[PDB]
Design a protein around this ligand. Structure first.
Ligand code: CLA
Ligand code: CLA
Ligand code: CLA
Ligand code: CLA
Ligand code: CLA
Ligand code: CLA
Ligand code: CLA
Ligand SMILES: CC1=C(C#C/C(C)=C/C=C/C(C)=C/C=C/C=C(C)/C=C/C=C(\C)C#CC2=C(C)C[C@@H](O)CC2(C)C)C(C)(C)C[C@H](O)C1
Ligand SMILES: CC1=C(C#C/C(C)=C/C=C/C(C)=C/C=C/C=C(C)/C=C/C=C(\C)C#CC2=C(C)C[C@@H](O)CC2(C)C)C(C)(C)C[C@H](O)C1
Ligand SMILES: CC1=C(C#C/C(C)=C/C=C/C(C)=C/C=C/C=C(C)/C=C/C=C(C)/C=C/C2=C(C)CCCC2(C)C)C(C)(C)C[C@H](O)C1
Ligand SMILES: CC1=CCCC(C)(C)[C@H]1/C=C/C(C)=C/C=C/C(C)=C/C=C/C=C(C)/C=C/C=C(C)/C=C/C1=C(C)CCCC1(C)C
Lengths: 73, 95, 174, 144, 166, 151, 68
């Protein structure tokens, strides 16, 4: 998701969400201190890389340990 | 002085629309049918009879195959359609 | 500032004390939500129907019309309804009361515009209320007996649901 | 006593409620009390809300109920003090008598006259909160 | 004046024959009054003819047809081309009594009154309006009784007078 | 007859006046909610809001928790509701710490002292409402079975 | 199967009545075209096509419900 979809779509969605929170009663009493923005281009590349790499490692580690354990242990 | 918006006073006409739509939906649906869902009665009368039958069996809800759900759905669908159309006709045209 | 019926409550704003039977009794504030004239027309219609029902419960305990005991047998009050749904009397009553209540709906349209007093159908053939003082006394008596009759019909029908006797038979066979 | 038997202080509430309910029995005593008291209490709720916001300058606890005119009598300037004092004393007293019935099962007058109340305890049904009397045996002495 | 608790109809006047101030729905406030009076008189006259036509066939019959037991039943036993011819003849009679102006905003533009076709007091007009108004409801009653009991009106009245059911 | 108008008669603000947003029913309901009702201290707003939310918080924990089929289901559900209440109170506290400057004004919700009063009221109301729900479900068999005791 | 009837004079009467009713209704409600002035062949075709549509529906319905 972070490597295929890119920033401007998510920024426009977050703009709609900012409008929704500012216009919703009983929730506009609560205000953010930092403005919500989409992740930057490099940050999103890094985050997609991190989720991708963690999935790679955990998938293969589970497969290799459980397969060797099931066949031999 | 019901405001339908920030500065838009509007007459909802809830008594007239409710009464006229109820009568204009119930009276045509008094037409009988010999099908087992109606049981020889009209849609409104079979619905009211089903209400009485299932209220005679309180706690116990009507079953899935019981005609109450289909009668209720069709009757309230036609009633809501009549109420919407009656609200449109009376609030808009008013003549 | 304070109500007369409930002395520890502030007087309702929509209750000025002009309508008959107004003792400032609205603790739940229903007249602030709904229209006061719609509520008054509802109160008078419920009360008049209850007056007829109370007098009818007592008289149907006292006597029945010729040929009624052939059709209803020993059934009383509520038990009559179902039977005379099949015979057809309740259908005729429903038809003609619905016909009258169409013009009653037009009268409700008149009273919601402010151009008609609630419950006023101009029905005084015998001219009982020719004096506005006698008119006021009759309005107070009508609304008091209507509310008492609402209580009475509640009591009579629920006593019949409990014992199956009816009002006067329960008064005798208690 | 033909309806509920010899129960005295809080088993009246329990016994009536055991015989109350559609299907459960024929009595409706506590439910009738709850109905009429709840009507009075809703009408009181509106007054508390009005006096809280300041829309009414009525005194707290004043419902205008003085049919016999004791406020227009002599010595009425201390009646509120006697009301509040006897109110607090009755609060403490009914706390006393209820916690006495929960242990001895007697009731107020038998408890007052039977001064060594742990030598003769009347057998009584458990209340509708029996868990609260659980530490009496293990944690507490359980003299009775 | 007919319904005292409702406001008077603003499009109604006592000059109209048969006026009683009876328009609770307000048809006159939404439709042309002359069209309504013309329709009332035609419904009237046709219902008077129908009242007579549901009574007299119970006793006398034309030999050209088969005598239906019920005078209402006659439309089911005579040839239907009779009814089609009656429709077409009534239509040419509507075209001839009028001047071909068989529509609103074509009617009454000659200054034609509602209901006059040159066949003749204003007490007589009220008599007409009332005897047609009564005949409409009477025709409804006679037709539905003759349909529900499957018997003639005088046969119903004199013999049995059983309650109608369906 | 137009039902949608610019918000606050301002056509360039980012809002519209709609029947859902600006009708008399909506205005009455919003102005009568404890978060907006006039004449309330922030503490009492907190008390009302906490009573409502803490009262309804017991139910899902009691009926759907891992101990729901045990005899201590209600006790576990109330304890879970209390833990959620404490977590939310910590959330309220840190929000007020980072969101507001220390000002003399204390009669408004969006002040530091006002938010602390609101948090105190919300904690006390939430604990009270959860305890009230616990008492009612403990003592009434209708609430234990969600109506199935009538069958 | 719903009962339909063989052709008779009643069927012809219903069809003719439906056609004439639709001709008059088309005279009254058609927006773009003494009372039968401007009456043209397409309007007659439209009215008689609706007259067969309404007559067919009425004949089938009255045969269904027993009126025949
Ligand atoms: C003398 C007048 C007359 C009479 C007595 C009848 C009588 C009848 N007609 Mg008929 N009809 C007439 C004139 C007449 N018609 C005319 C002038 C026309 C125009 C040509 C038609 C066209 C017509 C058609 C096309 C059909 C009938 C059918 C029927 C039969 C209906 C059976 C039933 O219960 O409906 C069924 C009742 C229902 C509730 C079924 C629902 C139908 C669909 C599935 C629902 C569609 C609605 C949809 C959801 C939209 C609603 C949403 C909304 C909010 C927008 C019934 C015997 C039907 C028939 O013969 O069946 C054997 C049929 O199909 N009629
Ligand atoms: C469901 C019942 C129903 C229907 C079909 C209509 C239909 C109509 N009314 Mg009306 N009305 C009703 C109930 C209804 N009304 C009631 C209860 C009241 C009293 C409150 C009024 C009061 C009222 C007034 C005061 C006026 C009208 C007018 C009109 C006409 C144009 C305005 C309009 O809404 O067009 C709606 C258009 C259509 C229905 C045709 C389009 C068809 C599509 C498929 C939509 C239909 C949906 C669906 C099939 C309906 C199913 C009904 C359901 C019960 C099964 C139109 C013929 C005005 C007029 O000029 O007539 C004299 C007018 O002045 N009405
Ligand atoms: C809420 C009113 C009400 C209802 C629903 C019923 C319903 C019924 N009554 Mg009952 N009844 C009523 C009031 C009512 N009654 C009154 C007020 C009396 C007289 C004190 C009676 C006396 C009575 C007897 C003696 C009998 C019934 C019977 C019956 C049953 C058959 C109908 C019948 O023959 O009625 C007949 C009833 C009447 C002729 C009474 C009419 C009185 C009218 C309504 C007074 C109002 C007129 C008013 C001046 C004009 C209004 C003008 C308008 C613009 C407002 C039926 C269950 C019969 C039955 O089955 O018994 C078990 C029977 O034998 N009724
Ligand atoms: C809805 C109520 C109701 C019902 C079911 C009946 C039913 C009946 N009435 Mg009856 N009646 C009623 C109201 C009612 N009436 C009222 C309101 C009056 C006016 C006082 C009458 C006055 C009346 C008379 C005068 C007679 C009947 C008679 C009859 C019976 C007909 C017997 C016969 O030979 O024909 C029939 C069972 C006849 C009979 O023989 O009854 C036993 C008879 O002579 N009725
Ligand atoms: C407009 C006039 C009118 C007309 C023509 C009818 C016609 C009828 N009514 Mg009826 N009715 C009317 C007004 C009218 N009602 C009014 C204003 C009320 C009071 C709201 C009633 C209350 C009423 C009841 C309670 C009963 C009838 C019944 C009947 C039926 C009697 C059949 C019979 O053989 O009795 C012949 C009797 C006589 C000639 C005696 C007089 C018949 C359908 C009876 C019936 O069987 O209904 C199915 C019935 O029980 N009606
Ligand atoms: C414009 C003038 C005119 C003409 C020429 C006709 C012609 C006819 N009308 Mg007619 N009618 C008219 C105006 C006219 N009408 C008007 C203005 C009205 C009032 C609105 C009526 C109302 C009316 C009714 C109510 C009836 C007639 C009937 C008839 C038919 C009678 C012959 C018959 O039954 O055999 C049937 C004829 C044909 C199938 C076609 C004609 C073929 C030849 C000519 C038939 C010869 C039959 C012969 C004369 C008699 C045979 C039997 C004999 C041994 C006694 C005949 C076709 C009757 C009818 O339709 O019966 C079926 C009928 O009941 N008409
Ligand atoms: C109650 C019966 C009745 C009455 C009082 C009238 C009265 C009137 N009609 Mg009228 N009419 C009637 C029935 C009646 N009609 C019927 C049933 C039809 C359908 C065929 C018509 C068709 C009709 C048309 C087409 C026209 C009139 C017109 C008139 C007016 C003529 C003015 C005039 O010359 O004054 C003098 C009026 C009279 C002397 C009235 C004569 C009516 C007599 C009294 C009826 C005879 C009764 C007798 C028993 C008939 C036997 C029938 C039996 C087999 C049942 C007048 C107001 C004309 C008018 O100006 O429109 C308003 C007009 O153009 N009428
Ligand atoms: C307006 C118009 C007029 C008209 C008129 C109309 C016809 C006026 C007729 C009016 C009548 C119907 C008024 C009825 C009141 C009934 C109530 C008050 C009694 C209720 C009983 C209660 C207390 C009880 C009960 C009790 C319990 C519950 C159960 C029982 O076991 C015991 C018990 C019975 C004690 C006329 C025609 C004159 C003309 C005029 O020009 C204008
Ligand atoms: C408003 C006003 C009026 C009103 C009035 C009426 C309704 C006033 C009603 C008043 C009530 C009855 C006063 C009750 C006080 C009870 C306390 C003081 C004694 C408490 C128990 C003690 C502490 C004890 C206990 C003890 C211990 C614990 C344990 C036991 O073993 C022994 C023992 C029992 C001794 C009226 C209607 C006239 C009209 C007027 O216009 C307006
Ligand atoms: C009906 C019913 C039930 C019930 C019930 C009820 C009614 C139960 C109990 C009710 C109440 C109100 C108990 C009160 C206890 C009061 C205490 C301990 C006060 C102590 C005061 C002191 C120490 C004062 C100290 C003092 C102070 C402050 C001021 C200075 C002086 C000093 C003396 C030092 C159940 C639960 C059994 C269930 C059943 O199914 C239904
Ligand atoms: C159903 C309805 C129909 C459809 C539409 C709809 C409106 C959306 C819907 C509503 C759904 C929702 C919105 C229904 C509304 C719901 C809310 C959840 C009801 C909350 C009630 C809180 C009360 C009972 C707790 C009260 C405090 C008690 C008295 C405490 C005493 C305590 C105090 C502190 C003092 C110490 C003693 C103790 C006991 C500890």
């Amino acid at each position: 998701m972070f490597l295929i979809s890119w920033r401007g779509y998510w920024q426009e969605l977050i703009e709609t969400l900012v409008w929704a929170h500012e216009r919703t009663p009983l929730a506009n009493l609560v205000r953010w201190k930092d403005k919500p923005v989409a992740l930057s281009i490099v940050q999103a590349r890094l985050v997609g890389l991190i989720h991708f790499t963690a999935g790679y490692i955990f998938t293969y580690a589970a497969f290799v340990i459980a397969s060797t354990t099931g066949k031999f242990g | 002085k019901f405001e339908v918006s920030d500065g838009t006073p509007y007459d909802l006409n809830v008594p007239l629309v409710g009464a006229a739509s109820f009568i204009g939906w119930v009276v045509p649906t008094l037409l009988p049918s010999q099908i087992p869902l109606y049981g020889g009665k009209g849609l409104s009368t079979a619905f009211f009879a089903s209400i009485g039958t299932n209220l005679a069996k309180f706690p116990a809800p009507p079953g899935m195959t019981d005609p109450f759900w289909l009668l209720c759905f069709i009757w309230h669908s036609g009633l809501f359609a009549t109420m919407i159309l009656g609200s449109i006709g009376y609030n808009g045209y008013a003549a | 500032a304070m109500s007369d019926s409930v002395p520890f409550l502030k007087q309702p704003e929509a209750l000025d004390g002009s309508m008959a039977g107004d003792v400032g009794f609205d603790p739940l504030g229903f007249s602030s939500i709904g229209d006061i004239n719609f509520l008054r027309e509802a109160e008078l219609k419920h009360g008049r129907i209850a007056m007829l029902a109370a007098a009818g419960s007592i008289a149907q305990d006292i006597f029945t019309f010729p040929g009624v005991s052939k059709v209803v047998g020993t059934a009383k009050m509520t038990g009559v309804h179902d039977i005379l749904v099949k015979q057809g009397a309740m259908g005729q009553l429903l038809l003609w009361l619905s016909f009258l209540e169409v013009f009653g709906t037009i009268a409700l349209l008149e009273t919601l515009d402010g151009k008609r007093a609630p419950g006023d159908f101009k029905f005084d053939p015998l001219n009982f209320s020719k004096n506005p003082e006698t008119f006021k006394r009759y309005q107070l008596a009508e609304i008091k007996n209507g509310r008492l009759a609402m209580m009475g019909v509640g009591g009579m029908v629920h006593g019949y649901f409990i014992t199956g006797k009816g009002p006067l038979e329960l008064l005798g066979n208690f | 006593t033909s309806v509920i038997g010899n129960v005295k202080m809080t088993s009246v509430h329990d016994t009536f409620l055991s015989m109350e309910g559609p299907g459960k029995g024929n009595q409706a005593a506590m439910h009738q009390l709850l109905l009429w008291l709840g009507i009075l209490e809703i009408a009181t709720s509106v007054a508390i809300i009005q006096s809280f916001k300041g829309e009414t300058n009525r005194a707290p606890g004043d419902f205008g109920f003085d049919p016999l005119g004791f406020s227009k009598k002599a010595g009425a300037e201390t009646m509120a003090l006697k009301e509040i004092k006897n109110g607090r004393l009755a609060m403490i007293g009914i706390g006393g008598m209820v916690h006495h019935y929960l242990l001895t099962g007697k009731g107020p007058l038998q408890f007052l006259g039977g001064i060594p109340n742990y030598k003769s305890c009347v057998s009584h049904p458990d209340s509708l909160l029996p868990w609260l009397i659980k530490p009496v045996g293990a944690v507490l002495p359980k003299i009775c | 004046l007919a319904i005292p608790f409702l406001k008077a109809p603003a499009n109604l006047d006592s000059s109209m024959p048969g006026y009683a101030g009876f328009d609770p729905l307000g048809f006159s406030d939404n439709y042309d009054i002359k069209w309504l009076q013309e329709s009332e008189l035609k419904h009237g006259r046709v219902a008077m003819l129908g009242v007579v036509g549901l009574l007299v066939p119970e006793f006398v019959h034309l030999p050209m047809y088969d005598a239906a037991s019920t005078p209402y039943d006659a439309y089911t036993t005579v040839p239907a081309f009779a009814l089609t011819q009656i429709l077409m003849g009534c239509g040419i009679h509507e075209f001839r009594t009028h001047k071909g102006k068989m529509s609103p905003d074509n009617m009454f533009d000659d200054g034609r009154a509602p209901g006059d076709f040159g066949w003749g007091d204003a007490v007589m007009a009220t008599k007409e309006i009332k005897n047609g108004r009564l005949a409409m409801l009477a025709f409804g009653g006679i037709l539905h009784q003759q349909l529900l009991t499957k018997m003639g009106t005088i046969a119903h009245l004199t013999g049995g007078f059983k309650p109608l059911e369906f | 007859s137009q039902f949608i108008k610019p918000y606050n008669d301002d056509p360039f603000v980012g809002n519209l006046a709609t029947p859902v947003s600006t009708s008399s029913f909506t205005k009455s309901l919003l102005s009568n909610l404890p978060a907006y009702r006039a004449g309330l201290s922030p503490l009492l707003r907190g008390v009302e809001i906490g009573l409502t939310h803490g009262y309804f918080l017991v139910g899902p924990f009691y009926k759907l928790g891992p101990l729901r089929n045990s005899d201590v289901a209600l006790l576990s559900g109330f304890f879970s509701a209390l833990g959620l209440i404490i977590i939310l109170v910590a959330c309220l506290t840190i929000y007020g710490v980072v969101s507001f400057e220390e000002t003399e004004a204390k009669d408004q919700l969006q002040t530091a002292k006002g938010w602390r009063q609101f948090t105190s009221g919300w904690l006390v109301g939430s604990v009270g409402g959860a305890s009230f729900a616990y008492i009612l479900i403990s003592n009434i068999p209708f609430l234990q079975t969600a109506g199935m005791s009538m069958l | 199967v719903p009962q339909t009837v063989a052709w008779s004079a009643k069927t012809g009467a219903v069809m003719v009545l439906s056609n004439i009713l639709c001709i008059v209704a088309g005279r009254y409600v058609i927006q773009v075209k003494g009372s039968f002035a401007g009456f043209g062949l397409p309007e007659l075709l439209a009215s008689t096509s609706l007259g067969h549509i309404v007559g067919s529906g009425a004949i089938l319905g009255l045969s269904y419900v027993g009126v025949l």
